[PDB]
Design a protein around this ligand. Structure first.
Ligand code: ZN
Ligand code: ZN
Ligand code: ZN
Length: 136
């Protein structure tokens, strides 16, 4: 649990695209404590509302016909967020890459450690706000 670091595990199995996020609360909300005031209350609500749009946090090509099947959000109060997302991509052959928008929604994240398991290969890469491409 390192502030500014986010864990990203992507699994691709047939039409199943599963992405899991482990993010410190400092990255997602801007602080890991109980909301002191209304500003912080809004920060938390904005975050939680953002976390249920993995289709905004991960740019999936329309051609891949990716539909959201699962949105799980776990907040543990330090403080941590786990999000687990499942897409069913009816043209998964056309999902060449994912362009993560994480750094745009949560700019206090500096690096994501991405693990990508597909039918063909495991691969790792470190992402930043400028290098957001994941190849499948
Ligand atoms: Zn929403
Ligand atoms: Zn912490
Ligand atoms: Zn299918």
């Amino acid at each position: 649990h390192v502030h500014g670091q986010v864990e990203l595990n992507i699994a691709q199995d047939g039409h199943d695209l599963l992405l899991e996020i482990t993010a410190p609360g400092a990255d997602v909300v801007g602080f890991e404590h109980a909301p002191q005031d209304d500003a912080q209350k809004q920060a938390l609500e904005k975050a939680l509302e953002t976390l249920h749009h993995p289709e905004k946090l991960f740019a999936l090509s329309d051609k891949a016909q990716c539909e959201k099947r699962e949105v799980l959000i776990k907040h543990t109060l330090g403080g941590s967020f786990t999000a687990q997302y499942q897409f069913h991509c009816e043209a998964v052959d056309q999902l060449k890459q994912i362009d993560t928008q994480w750094f745009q929604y949560f700019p206090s994240t500096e690096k994501i450690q991405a693990n990508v398991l597909t039918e063909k290969q495991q691969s790792a890469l470190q992402l930043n706000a400028k290098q957001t491409l994941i190849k499948l």
